[PDB]
Scaffold this active site. Structure first.
Site, mmCIF file in Angstrom:
data_model
loop_
_atom_site.group_PDB
_atom_site.id
_atom_site.type_symbol
_atom_site.label_atom_id
_atom_site.label_comp_id
_atom_site.label_asym_id
_atom_site.label_seq_id
_atom_site.Cartn_x
_atom_site.Cartn_y
_atom_site.Cartn_z
ATOM 1 N NE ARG A 55 -57.079 16.279 12.366
ATOM 2 C CZ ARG A 55 -55.770 16.442 12.180
ATOM 3 N NH1 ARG A 55 -55.330 17.473 11.467
ATOM 4 N NH2 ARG A 55 -54.901 15.580 12.691
ATOM 5 C CG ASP A 99 -44.805 10.888 13.299
ATOM 6 O OD1 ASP A 99 -44.674 12.123 13.160
ATOM 7 O OD2 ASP A 99 -45.468 10.381 14.229
ATOM 8 C CG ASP A 156 -51.636 11.612 12.491
ATOM 9 O OD1 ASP A 156 -51.854 12.652 13.158
ATOM 10 O OD2 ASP A 156 -50.507 11.083 12.378
ATOM 11 C CG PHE A 192 -56.477 7.116 3.990
ATOM 12 C CD1 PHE A 192 -56.965 6.047 4.729
ATOM 13 C CD2 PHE A 192 -55.230 7.001 3.390
ATOM 14 C CE1 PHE A 192 -56.229 4.873 4.870
ATOM 15 C CE2 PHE A 192 -54.484 5.838 3.519
ATOM 16 C CZ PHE A 192 -54.983 4.770 4.259
ATOM 17 C CE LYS A 245 -54.779 25.507 6.393
ATOM 18 N NZ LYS A 245 -54.674 24.445 7.448
ATOM 19 C CG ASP A 294 -48.948 20.584 11.959
ATOM 20 O OD1 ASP A 294 -50.116 20.993 12.151
ATOM 21 O OD2 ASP A 294 -48.578 19.429 12.273
ATOM 22 C CG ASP A 295 -43.654 19.727 13.849
ATOM 23 O OD1 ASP A 295 -44.714 19.120 13.585
ATOM 24 O OD2 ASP A 295 -42.539 19.341 13.441
ATOM 25 C CE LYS A 303 -45.006 14.763 10.471
ATOM 26 N NZ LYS A 303 -45.166 14.653 11.958
ATOM 27 C CG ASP A 336 -50.374 11.531 16.149
ATOM 28 O OD1 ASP A 336 -49.487 10.670 16.312
ATOM 29 O OD2 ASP A 336 -50.335 12.327 15.182
ATOM 30 C CG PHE A 339 -47.736 23.045 5.563
ATOM 31 C CD1 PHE A 339 -48.419 21.875 5.835
ATOM 32 C CD2 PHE A 339 -48.446 24.222 5.540
ATOM 33 C CE1 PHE A 339 -49.791 21.881 6.072
ATOM 34 C CE2 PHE A 339 -49.810 24.228 5.776
ATOM 35 C CZ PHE A 339 -50.481 23.053 6.039
HETATM 36 O O1 LIG Z 1 -48.510 16.724 13.588
HETATM 37 P P1 LIG Z 1 -49.005 15.465 12.790
HETATM 38 O O2 LIG Z 1 -47.903 14.955 11.726
HETATM 39 O O3 LIG Z 1 -49.495 14.376 13.696
HETATM 40 C C1 LIG Z 1 -50.304 16.260 11.777
HETATM 41 O O4 LIG Z 1 -49.669 17.359 11.132
HETATM 42 C C2 LIG Z 1 -50.950 15.325 10.673
HETATM 43 N N1 LIG Z 1 -50.008 14.816 9.619
HETATM 44 C C3 LIG Z 1 -49.688 13.555 9.398
HETATM 45 C C4 LIG Z 1 -48.792 13.544 8.360
HETATM 46 N N2 LIG Z 1 -48.680 14.768 8.063
HETATM 47 C C5 LIG Z 1 -49.371 15.508 8.777
HETATM 48 P P2 LIG Z 1 -51.667 16.840 12.947
HETATM 49 O O5 LIG Z 1 -51.183 18.058 13.824
HETATM 50 O O6 LIG Z 1 -52.651 17.597 11.962
HETATM 51 O O7 LIG Z 1 -52.180 15.758 13.809
HETATM 52 C C1 LIG Z 2 -49.640 17.799 7.361
HETATM 53 C C2 LIG Z 2 -50.513 18.359 8.200
HETATM 54 C C3 LIG Z 2 -50.159 19.569 9.009
HETATM 55 C C4 LIG Z 2 -51.924 17.804 8.379
HETATM 56 C C5 LIG Z 2 -53.012 18.921 8.579
HETATM 57 O O1 LIG Z 2 -52.885 19.819 7.490
HETATM 58 P P1 LIG Z 2 -53.896 20.966 7.167
HETATM 59 O O2 LIG Z 2 -54.114 21.729 8.518
HETATM 60 O O3 LIG Z 2 -53.544 21.774 5.981
HETATM 61 O O4 LIG Z 2 -55.228 20.052 7.006
HETATM 62 P P2 LIG Z 2 -56.692 20.775 6.847
HETATM 63 O O5 LIG Z 2 -57.389 20.552 8.241
HETATM 64 O O6 LIG Z 2 -56.848 22.180 6.370
HETATM 65 O O7 LIG Z 2 -57.194 19.624 5.872
HETATM 66 MG MG LIG Z 3 -51.683 14.157 14.764
HETATM 67 MG MG LIG Z 4 -49.116 18.451 13.932
HETATM 68 MG MG LIG Z 5 -48.972 12.635 13.472
#
Ligand SMILES: O=P(O)(O)C(O)(Cn1ccnc1)P(=O)(O)O
Ligand SMILES: C=C(C)CCOP(=O)(O)OP(=O)(O)O
Ligand SMILES: [Mg+2]
Ligand SMILES: [Mg+2]
Ligand SMILES: [Mg+2]
Ligand SMILES: O=P(O)(O)C(O)(Cn1ccnc1)P(=O)(O)O
Ligand SMILES: C=C(C)CCOP(=O)(O)OP(=O)(O)O
Ligand SMILES: [Mg+2]
Ligand SMILES: [Mg+2]
Ligand SMILES: [Mg+2]
Lengths: 346, 346
Positions: A105, A167, A96, A91, A50, A236-237, A193, A100, A232
């Site tokens: 992605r 994490d 990750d 990066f 995004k 995401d969780d 994180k 993970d 945020f």
């Molecule tokens: O849930 P994660 O922290 O593993 C993640 O949010 C990536 N991330 C890592 C640190 N902050 C965010 P993603 O769902 O995008 O795999």
């Molecule tokens: C901290 C998190 C949730 C990593 C992914 O964030 P975003 O969903 O905003 O990453 P983009 O794919 O848009 O770069």
């Molecule tokens: Mg992840």
């Molecule tokens: Mg996540």
């Molecule tokens: Mg992670």
């Protein structure tokens, strides 16, 4: 709306980012093949999200510099730095996904799973991080904020690295422990994180480029932006388990990986003694059968409503903080970003 | 001899490196567990090698600063920076062992193979890299060479990263191609993957700390040190296959990983047409049977003598270059380092 109108400019400038990185070392045709793979890497991992972070750097710039000073060169530095935060994103994400054990992605197969790639992604990821500082020197070696930026990126990387460690310690594969999935632990994890690199980094970069380097002003912007970070991550969780993978661009993995997710933490708080044992028996395992059992107890505890209520209560607290701490900055800055993540589904 | 007398001082100062890194963020007891794992990581990956790079920073310092200026504080900065090059070593090695699928390092199981660790080593490695710049700010934030050091480390990391990419592109697992195992390719690979970070980094760090920042002086020191790098990698490619793992501290993997090793390149040059086909049939496979077949054709072509002859011819060319390019620096600087890797077996 403002990210909307600036988005396209931002992306089109990516051609040049790539040009400059894959030419500045091409007067050494020996490492040409290597430089070739760098193009490939960038194109695959820098593009497709995004661009909230990169746009934020750019948008925040235009709102903090008098238009008399938003000249041609200076504006270019804005989106280069915006793309530098975008590379930090790349990066950390490439790394990750490996860690993970993720599958997709940004709606494609993760880099490390692209056939021909695998654990070489590790070196590819470091390279991405390396480019941040290539650009920084290329376009700002002479600004007075040059050292402030190098240190803000380094510092932010370290912070999210501590976060990632936090994490991962909390989610030992094979070591299903729910006792550690508390609230203090969650807040600490997401702060380091996600919070620093995804919210304080972009805005602070724009502040330093606009001369705004007072300690209190960053301290205050940070107070807002760290609270947006946690919101945020919690979003995401949630989407990890409750969102359409064809729309999030990624297949969720939190329950399998034994992650200290927001849900599992809110689930422990509402856990009748019988349910707790059900959680203890299915969490952190790859069996689809057991994972859905988990999802079920989440839906039995109407967590998908608790998340909607948190979202509101939280969004208003952010608002309160933008009203408390924004000035002397334009509240537009923080409202704009916050409005771009409210209720999101990707 | 000089590395010998300075070694112990160097190692004992590691207690403090660790103290400072694991306390400067302990006023945040939230990330304490994370900071705990950092101690653990450092102790396992920073310690156990020869410390040639870190000592070099320290030794080179004492030889380039008038003793009137080798005060207490200034001397401390020397071994901190020496330990920073040591952390770069750790960063890259943890990553490389994962990517090379190695089994031991410095005579223990590789970090990524320590049970409980695995691919989390990826984040652990990034952390190591992060500490470099934590220390740099902690102890030199105010020196005039502060920005020179940050950029020398960044730049060197990028360089070896390009190197590693070069390294990995040339050794596709499953894609046995010998055509690419040439000489121009080898020289390019080792230059970027070893030469800059293992020889030009330490000495240049000591130069910048001693005020020596002229462009020609670094260009000349580099001319020597890059040639020592290639020597040093070739020694390492040899020991990979021909050294005792109980003494190198690591079990070799070059032939299995399909690596553009020095031997396989010198082997292609002396390859009778029949032998070439034997090489084409066994290289880059995990079967012990096939690997030894390779070792055999190496010994049939008396490569272990060609390596001894290169070692001499090479060592004398380095010498010539120390005689051509050392000044105004003390030749002791380059002789000392070069004398510490001649004929080595670990
Ligand atoms: O849930 P994660 O922290 O593993 C993640 O949010 C990536 N991330 C890592 C640190 N902050 C965010 P993603 O769902 O995008 O795999
Ligand atoms: C901290 C998190 C949730 C990593 C992914 O964030 P975003 O969903 O905003 O990453 P983009 O794919 O848009 O770069
Ligand atoms: Mg992840
Ligand atoms: Mg996540
Ligand atoms: Mg992670
Ligand atoms: O032989 P590699 O280049 O893989 C090695 O020398 C490490 N390395 C990586 C870059 N430079 C050196 P190691 O044998 O120590 O595994
Ligand atoms: C470039 C190479 C050969 C990596 C290992 O070098 P060293 O053998 O000198 O590393 P230490 O284990 O002594 O740190
Ligand atoms: Mg290697
Ligand atoms: Mg290796
Ligand atoms: Mg080797």
């Amino acid at each position: 709306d403002v990210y909307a109108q600036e988005k396209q400019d931002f992306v089109q400038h990516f051609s040049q980012i790539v040009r400059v990185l894959t030419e500045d070392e091409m007067g050494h045709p020996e490492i040409g093949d290597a430089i070739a793979r760098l193009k490939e890497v960038l194109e695959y991992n820098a593009i497709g999200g995004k661009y909230n972070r990169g746009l934020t750097v750019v948008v925040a710039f235009r709102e903090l510099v008098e238009p008399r000073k938003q000249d041609a060169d200076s504006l270019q530095r804005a989106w280069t730095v915006g793309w530098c935060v975008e590379l930090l994103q790349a990066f950390f994400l490439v790394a990750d996904d490996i860690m993970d054990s993720s599958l997709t992605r940004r709606g494609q197969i993760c880099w490390y799973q692209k056939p021909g790639v695998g654990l070489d992604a590790i070196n590819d990821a470091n390279l991405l991080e390396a480019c941040i500082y290539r650009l920084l020197k290329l376009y700002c070696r002479e600004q007075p904020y040059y050292l402030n930026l190098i240190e803000l990126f380094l510092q932010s990387s370290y912070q999210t690295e501590i976060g990632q460690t936090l994490d991962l310690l909390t989610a030992p594969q094979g070591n299903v422990d729910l006792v550690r999935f508390t609230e203090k632990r969650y807040k600490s994890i997401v702060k380091y994180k996600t919070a620093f690199y995804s919210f304080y980094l972009p805005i602070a970069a724009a502040m330093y480029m606009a001369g705004i380097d007072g300690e209190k002003e960053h301290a205050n912007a940070k107070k807002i932006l760290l609270e947006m970070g946690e919101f945020f991550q919690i979003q995401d969780d949630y989407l990890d388990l409750f969102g359409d993978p064809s729309v999030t661009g990624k297949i969720g993995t939190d329950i399998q990986d034994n992650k200290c997710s927001w849900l599992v933490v809110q689930c422990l708080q509402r856990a009748t003694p019988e349910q707790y044992q059900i959680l203890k028996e299915n969490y952190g395992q790859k069996e689809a059968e057991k994972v859905a059992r988990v999802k079920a107890l989440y839906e039995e505890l109407d967590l998908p409503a608790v998340f909607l209520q948190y979202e509101e209560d939280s969004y208003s607290h952010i608002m309160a903080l933008i009203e408390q701490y924004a000035a002397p900055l334009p509240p537009a800055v923080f409202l704009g970003l916050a409005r771009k993540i409210y209720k999101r589904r990707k």
